Amino acid sequence: SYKLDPYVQRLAETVFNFQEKVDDLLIIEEKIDLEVRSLETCMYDHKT
Amino acid sequence: SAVMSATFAKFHPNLVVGGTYSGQIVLWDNRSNKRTPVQRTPLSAAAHTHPVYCVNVVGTQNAHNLISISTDGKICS
Numbered sequence: 001s002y003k004l005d006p007y008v009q010r011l012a013e014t015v016f017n018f019q020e021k022v023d024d025l026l027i028i029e030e031k032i033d034l035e036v037r038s039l040e041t042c043m044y045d046h047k048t
Numbered sequence: 049s050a051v052m053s054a055t056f057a058k059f060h061p062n063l064v065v066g067g068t069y070s071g072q073i074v075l076w077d078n079r080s081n082k083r084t085p086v087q088r089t090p091l092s093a094a095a096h097t098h099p100v101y102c103v104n105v106v107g108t109q110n111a112h113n114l115i116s117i118s119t120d121g122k123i124c125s
Contacts, residue, residue, distance in 0.1 A: 005092055009092050010057070012070060012088060013087070013090060015088075016074060016084075016085050016086065017087050019084045019086075020080075020082045022087040033091065040052060
């Protein structure tokens with residue numbers, strides 16, 4: 001009974017923010033992969 | 049989790065909120081496009097300690113507070 005409700009609620013708020021961060025983490029990894037390989041069908045890009 | 053009568057908020061129709069099953073009014077911004085609940089409030093004595101019943105807005109835009117009267121006999125705004 002030291003921190004059941006306190007640490008549980010802290011992990012709950014960070015858990016919901018982490019669920020949003022899970023979907024956003026998939027989107028973040030997708031943004032990094034897109035920025036690493038987005039010129040797969042470009043028409044002779046040099047400065048780009 | 050299965051919420052209990054969620055509703056909207058003020059100044060935009062994106063950051064909605066609603067009393068979830070854990071005991072608080074879980075909020076989420078529709079402009080951020082999040083599938084599950086984006087940020088859930090603390091479900092402690094501040095929110096509904098017991099189950100949830102209903103959530104809504106409070107007053108006009110001058111004092112629109114997210115007020116939820118749950119299944120714990122409390123209107124937490």
